[PDB]
Design a protein around this ligand. Sequence first.
Ligand SMILES: Nc1ccn([C@H]2O[C@@H](COP(=O)(O)O)[C@@H](O)[C@H]2O)c(=O)n1
Length: 205
Amino acid sequence: YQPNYFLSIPITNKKITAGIKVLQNSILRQDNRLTKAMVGDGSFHITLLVMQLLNEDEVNIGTDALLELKPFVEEILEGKHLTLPFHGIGTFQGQVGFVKLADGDHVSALLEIAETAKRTFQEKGILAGESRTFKPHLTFMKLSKAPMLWKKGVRKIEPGLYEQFIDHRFGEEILYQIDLCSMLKKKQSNGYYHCESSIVIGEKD
Ligand SMILES: Nc1ccn([C@H]2O[C@@H](COP(=O)(O)O)[C@@H](O)[C@H]2O)c(=O)n1
């Protein structure tokens, strides 16, 4: 199925977004045709779960399911914070470029949150989740965003464009928020996706 909504972990740690800005600009000075493939400023996130929300009532149900997920996330983390380290560069088949979540204990916890997200949402009657294995990543570019490159001379991201950053520590994000976002509505003025609702992670209540 084709989702139109997702759970999003916003990656706003200044160091991370700044390092990605430098990455993106370095690529663009090498080949300015890649401009439209770059994800926009303010849009950086990790996708936690995809889903379909097809009317106003389901959207409101989506919001209720997100609220319910909150206590489940803190049980999984055992009264601790989740630290997401972002280090180096990967691609899905040269078509999507992303900063890679480093390996650690945090990876399994993240997977457990994603799986608990899917179950929480489905039990509310929401088509949520994918069959594909969950591979968290922080996208900085996707060629599908610039469909004119396919027709032009550009059918993959040249690994030479980012060679200087393949080992680069972008920084660490502590999980602080989960957003319910529209994939298709107009973005906020700050460049983030349209946000139906949000919950806080990692703070005193
Ligand atoms: N395992 C995965 C997970 C996501 N993807 C994606 O790359 C994505 C860009 O990443 P985000 O939307 O999650 O930032 C999607 O457009 C989808 O094509 C993939 O190609 N393989």
